[PDB]
Amino acid sequence: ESFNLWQECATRCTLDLAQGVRASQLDVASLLGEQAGSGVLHYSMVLEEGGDSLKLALGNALTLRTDGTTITLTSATAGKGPRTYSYTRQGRGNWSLHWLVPVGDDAPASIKVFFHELDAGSEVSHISPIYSIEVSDDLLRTMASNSTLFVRHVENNEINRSLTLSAAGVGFVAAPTQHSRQKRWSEWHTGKVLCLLDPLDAVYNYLSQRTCNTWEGKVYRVLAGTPASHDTHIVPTAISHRLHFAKGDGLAALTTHQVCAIPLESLARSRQPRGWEELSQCGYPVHNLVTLYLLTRLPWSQLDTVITQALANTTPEDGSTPRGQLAQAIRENPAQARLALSMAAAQSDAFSHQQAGNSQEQAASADVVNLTCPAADLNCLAPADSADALQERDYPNGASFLGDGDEVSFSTAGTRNWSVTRLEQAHRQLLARGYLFVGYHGTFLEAAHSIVFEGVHERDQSSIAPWQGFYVAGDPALAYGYAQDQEADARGRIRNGVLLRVYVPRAALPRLFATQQTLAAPGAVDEIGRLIGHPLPLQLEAITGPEEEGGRLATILGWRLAEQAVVIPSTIPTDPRNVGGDLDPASVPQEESAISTLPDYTTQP
Ligand code: NA
């Protein structure tokens, strides 16, 4: 009842399933060798006739069930119990089974499984989410050395009990022998995991309309069989990447990733537990604030009262209680408490609107769906099967536009390695890649780091409804007033902040509106609502208008547009010795003024 998948099915095999179960050994341990090092195994095969009524076991307690309607994946985990993922087939006929298994002592503690539905031409017509599972330690070792593929027909109305496989094979990509582990595996929990395998590059490129510019010099070495590289002409669509966490700290992990610009794989399960030593300065404090808030079971709606009372420190607190520990954590770093808790609150809110029963409790331990948003498209639709997950939209960020030079970083003493020359180069690159400047954002140092090195993310602004959005000023003097801490840190000092330059995609230009009314006036809500063709809050639109009557101009980017903005540093410094003082007009370099022409905004007739 055995077979050789990689010898018989490398081209095309028809297996008899009439007498029950068929099994093949997937021995990669021999083919790899003693020390082929750290990297990624890519197993793949095409399932043809018989592939719509099957039970496959890719290992002990990893099962695939295909009934023609769904393809379901049941796995044992390193966590509390097994998990089930279910893909609704969008098409009919042949499909590609892919699974990625990392190799090495310091390699990620998850596998990838995903399905590509094929048309008559053997091109990809539909893709599943990339399912990322923190499997049992047993599966991590087994699926990387010697694993057994069991195949059983499951009874339906089909008279015949056979399975035709083609293009069965396993490739191995060796990780470039350089770089920290953090950097090596940084794309593991993004759309760009597909970029690590030559045979899946074209799929990432075509769907996203974005280049794979990971691991320069890598070689896709076929170990056995003949893996297929399928072309696709699918209309641009979002690549979904579902991330399971054995620890169940999805919301804490995503917020930590977004606040600290730490790759989400470094906050996943570790094979060799290492503690928080490598991530002690932003990682631990941010993760601890969100964990502690959730343990109090306070609603996110009460965030403003919780922070106000913690900073006042007038009320008597029990330092032993979760409520008291949260309050100490907030005093210990007010800046990142505001940034982190407000970002977690907005994510919990968006999650609760996705479907019924998406409570605060469920958001805390939900999976994360990462979405690779197609370039040259202002709409990034998540697939319906992601309603039960925390959703992160990956768009290009400021970090990818900084050009060549030493590491840009933020401090009270000024922005490091950010010359008038480097900004000019970055600006030209942004204009050439279809962006335009809409003004200045002033903020505190930790917010600047998040916005540039990770990207703009929605923060809870429920108190100012319906005027939620990313606030920008054409005049840097207005932004400057906000480029500082809102209150004293634990050491009792208020720090100067950072001025940032905000760029939106050129396609948004039609929906950048202006008005001569004050942006929180009586009739203004309804007058702006008619101007943008729907009620506030703003979506894929901006509004520019006087902040006060006779005041300077404020620009509000709707959060759905703001997330697609690219933000880079200004060369306009904040004054470390005049914190609360006005911008010195003499400190604005002529070379930055010259590239800061605002676009012509659309007004009411
Ligand atoms: Na992200």
Author numbering: 15 to 227, 231 to 622
Cite, word for word, the article reporting this structure:
Members of the diphthamide-specific class of mono-ADP-ribosyl transferases (mART), which include the diphtheria toxin (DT), Pseudomonas exotoxin A (PE) and Vibrio cholerae cholix (Chx), are potent bacterial toxins that specifically modify the diphthamide residue of eukaryotic ribosomal elongation factor 2 (eEF2), which plays an essential role in protein synthesis. These toxins catalyse the transfer of ADP-ribose from nicotinamide adenine dinucleotide (NAD+) onto the diphthamide, which results in inhibition of protein synthesis and thus death of the host eukaryotic cells. Among the many virulence factors produced by Aeromonas, a Pseudomonas exotoxin A homologue, AE, was shown to be expressed and play a key role in the virulence of Aeromonas hydrophila strains causing necrotising fasciitis, likely by causing tissue damage. The tri-domain crystal structure provides strong evidence that AE is a fourth member of this toxin family.
